[PDB]
Paper text:
[name] is involved in eukaryotic DNA-damage recognition and activates the Fanconi anemia (FA) pathway through complex formation. [name] is one of the [name]-associating components and contains a histone-fold DNA-binding domain. The [name]-associated histone-fold protein ([name]) 1/2 complex (also known as [name]/[name]) associates with the conserved region of [name] immediately after the helicase domain to form a [name]–[name] complex.
Unexpectedly, structure determination revealed that one of the crystals contained the [name]–[name] complex but that the other two contained the [name] complex without [name]. The tetrahedral and rod-shaped crystals contained only [name]. Owing to its high resolution, 169 residues and 249 solvent molecules were placed. The root-mean-square displacement (r.m.s.d.) of the heterodimer region was 0.5–0.6 Å. How [name] dissociates from [name] was further investigated and it was found that the presence of 2-methyl-2,4-pentanediol (MPD) and an oxidative environment may have promoted its release. However, under these conditions [name] retained its complexed form.
Numbering used by the authors:
A (entry chain B), B (entry chain B): 7 to 101
C (entry chain C), D (entry chain C): 7 to 80
Amino acid sequence: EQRELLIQRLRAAVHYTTGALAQDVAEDKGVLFSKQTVAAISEITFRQAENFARDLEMFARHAKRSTITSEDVKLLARRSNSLLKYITQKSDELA
Amino acid sequence: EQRELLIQRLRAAVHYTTGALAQDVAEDKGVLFSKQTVAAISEITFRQAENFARDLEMFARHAKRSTITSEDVKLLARRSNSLLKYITQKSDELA
Amino acid sequence: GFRKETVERLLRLHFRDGRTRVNGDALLLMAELLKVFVREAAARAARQAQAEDLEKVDIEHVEKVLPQLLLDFV
Amino acid sequence: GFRKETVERLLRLHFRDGRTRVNGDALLLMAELLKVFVREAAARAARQAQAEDLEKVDIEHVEKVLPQLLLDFV
């Protein structure tokens, strides 16, 4: 049904982006990622997006908000100083 | 100095509790935990307490609070339905 | 790498509360976070293949790096 | 397993803000969470040793179960 087809379309979109990003790493490092490997990274990313989504929803709610903001995204990166610095850079760039 | 000795005392306290809890598992399962293994689990627990502490502090602050409450602890367990159910049971028991 | 509209649809797939929405800032930052995650997965798996003297990255290389990858992203 | 006073001292060791305190409910729940964490580490390492036909649990058994343990506790 509609939700199954939506999931397929979203997995396909993640897979397309994953292959593009992997190709860039491949050219830099002199490796090639097999089709099976690209599909595996894409599925891991699709599943990781669920963990992120559920965390963001709970983090916003913990602050009594229904709308997820940059503050919630920064909280996802809290354990890695380098990731938090990178996300904060991207947030500070926005108008 | 004082902080180094404090860290030693807290590692010793965690180690004592870890050995007690491991002995209970050992008797149930018919294994024995070597001294090296107990020390390893204790050090992993000491390090994991840092991740918990830093998360709790940030979770409370995300809600504009300086005091960490049961709501922040529940948020630590959010990804495991069974852990959240267990923590919620223990919280609901309190007067 | 990821479009904001795709990120929104991905996140909305998993929200458990019907009230939940995501602002534009957060969608952009999530697109950036997802891109970093994919790039890290690929780069780490590539380095693992290289350490095993293989030019082709296989699922086994992804599996080897996956636990620390997930731990690094919480 | 863990005393509330020990848990408080452990957590206060790592707080980065001087304003941070922890209420009694949270200390009790954290003692319970730490106890579950230790019991899980021990039980999982024991099952791994058993699967390798060893009655003595070694650091290698802890190391094998550690990544999924940490992933299960976030």
